[PDB]
């Protein structure tokens, strides 16, 4: 019936149970007299199970009693978890009162089967011009953000979730664990600032917490997103749910930290034996089912600043789009600064996006690359070369670089809450006009801080 702890090393705890009752894999046990919950990771015969601690270690001693819930760690989900902050196990930490809901879901579920995948690749419309032109997004895809050297990741995500908040029905989830705490505070206060905190759910995991808490977190965010997607109106179209994950690197690192003590040999450059499996178990649940669609945005940090390390090696095999931003051009004054040439997608195919979109994106990429190789410092003589052969290339590169800039609602300085979600066509037609050269008379500075091609026409014509 009940068990007693027999060995405590770090966060790994061995418990022993009667021969008949041994908790199954991933079942959750309650240790009486403390807030600790135990998660089973392996069976070791003779009625002994290795476990990790969900909560913190408040002086546990050998011989303490423990009972079994006989069910996985089930998070309470529903419509009553909107606009609240909850811990990994689902308790509020904003002191705003208990969550009044009854629907509970386990966080360990199998991925959608082969027959349940979507029958098309539609693309999610976004107000951001650059992400919609040179790296199209996928309504079921799982994009990743490797852009570093900047704190704008939180600001960029705020603009994105907010434009999405208007663009998408709602019911978004933010599973932030092992993140910069002041950045999480800025997230919370920003969402309250724009009065959009309702309809969003947040799950936060603190770095001081044992690896048990720093783990099984994204799982909870994933479970909450699913209850929403499957939700259906009387019409029956489920909702396009979004999910955010600030760090997956920390997820892998927690796995690595607990692997060795669990009786598993080292491998690779020191990682755990089960890396691809542990990442796939998560990445295979973010799919666009026939009824509803979950998309994800994850910020991924590359250790040692190389793409060869095993963790990013297993990460890159699951994504559909990669977005990298750097301060090198952000310094120019383009607030939405994302490196256009670096960005890549598996949806820039000519057929899915249209032949015209494909060719115009390729032309813009070629112009940018040509200007990059022909820098005015690369050619020490500077200007006065290739007149309209590479000069016009320089001018067009300048104009496109300025046109990347997009005013935003959140940045209340100099902007009256613009919230410009530009129609995709308008951007395409404006870039077609720029490529054709009909804008060669427009002043360059008129192209900066522009809301739309009409907007820029007005800005040029006033002066």
């Amino acid at each position: 019936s009940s068990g007693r702890i027999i060995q405590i090393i770090g966060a790994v705890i061995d418990v022993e149970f009667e021969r008949t009752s041994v908790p199954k894999i991933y079942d959750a046990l309650q240790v009486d007299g403390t807030e600790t919950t135990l998660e089973v990771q392996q069976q070791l015969g003779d009625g002994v199970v290795r476990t990790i601690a969900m909560g913190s270690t408040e002086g546990l001693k050998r011989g303490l009693t423990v009972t079994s819930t006989n069910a996985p760690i089930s998070v309470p989900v529903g419509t009553a978890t909107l606009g609240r902050i909850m811990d990994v196990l689902g308790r509020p930490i904003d002191e705003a009162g208990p969550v009044a809901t009854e629907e509970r879901l386990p966080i360990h579920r199998q991925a959608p089967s082969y027959a349940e995948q979507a029958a098309s690749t539609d693309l999610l419309e976004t107000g951001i011009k650059v992400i919609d032109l040179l790296c199209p997004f996928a309504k079921g895809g799982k994009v990743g953000l490797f852009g570093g050297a900047g704190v704008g990741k939180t600001v960029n995500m705020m603009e994105l979730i907010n434009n999405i908040a208007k663009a998408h029905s709602g019911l978004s989830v933010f599973a932030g664990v092992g993140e910069r705490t002041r950045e999480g505070n800025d997230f919370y206060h920003e969402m309250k600032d724009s009065n959009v905190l309702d309809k969003v759910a947040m799950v936060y995991g603190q770095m001081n917490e044992p690896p048990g808490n720093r783990l099984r977190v994204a799982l909870t965010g994933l479970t909450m997103a699913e209850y929403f997607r499957d939700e259906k109106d009387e019409n029956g179209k489920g909702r396009d749910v979004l999910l955010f994950v600030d760090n997956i690197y920390r997820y892998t690192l927690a796995g690595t930290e607990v692997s060795a003590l669990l009786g598993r040999m080292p491998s690779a450059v020191g990682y755990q034996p089960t890396l691809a499996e542990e990442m796939g178990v998560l990445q295979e649940r973010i799919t666009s089912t026939k009824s509803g669609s979950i998309t994800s945005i994850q910020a991924v940090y590359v250790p040692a600043d190389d793409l060869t390390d095993p963790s990013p090696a297993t990460t890159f095999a699951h994504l559909d789009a990669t977005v990298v931003l750097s301060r090198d051009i952000a310094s120019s004054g383009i607030y939405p600064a994302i490196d256009p040439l670096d960005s890549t997608s598996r949806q820039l195919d000519p057929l899915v996006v249209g032949q015209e979109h494909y060719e115009i994106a390729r032309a813009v990429q070629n112009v940018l690359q040509r200007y990059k190789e022909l820098k005015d410092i690369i050619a020490i003589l500077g200007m006065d070369e290739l007149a309209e052969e590479d000069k016009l290339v320089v001018y067009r590169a300048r104009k496109i670089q300025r046109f990347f800039s997009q005013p935003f609602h959140v940045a209340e300085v100099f902007t009256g809450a613009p919230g410009k979600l530009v129609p995709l066509k308008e951007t395409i037609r404006g870039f077609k006009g720029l490529l054709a050269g009909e804008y060669d008379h427009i002043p360059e500075q008129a192209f900066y801080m522009v809301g739309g091609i009409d907007e820029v026409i007005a800005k040029a014509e006033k002066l």
Partner: protein, 48 residues
């Protein structure tokens, strides 16, 4: 023009010498890294 040809040919030869030396250093470092990784793996596997 007659000077530039010999200048660039000497530059190419010097580049060849430098790349040979760098290749030697690279091979030494690669063998050391492989040895270190194997030693670490065996030592860790002995611990468990």
């Amino acid at each position: 023009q007659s000077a530039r040809m010999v200048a660039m040919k000497a530059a190419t030869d010097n580049a060849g010498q430098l790349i040979k030396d760098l290749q030697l250093i690279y091979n030494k470092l690669r063998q050391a890294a492989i040895t270190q990784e194997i030693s670490e793996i065996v030592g860790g596997a002995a611990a468990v």
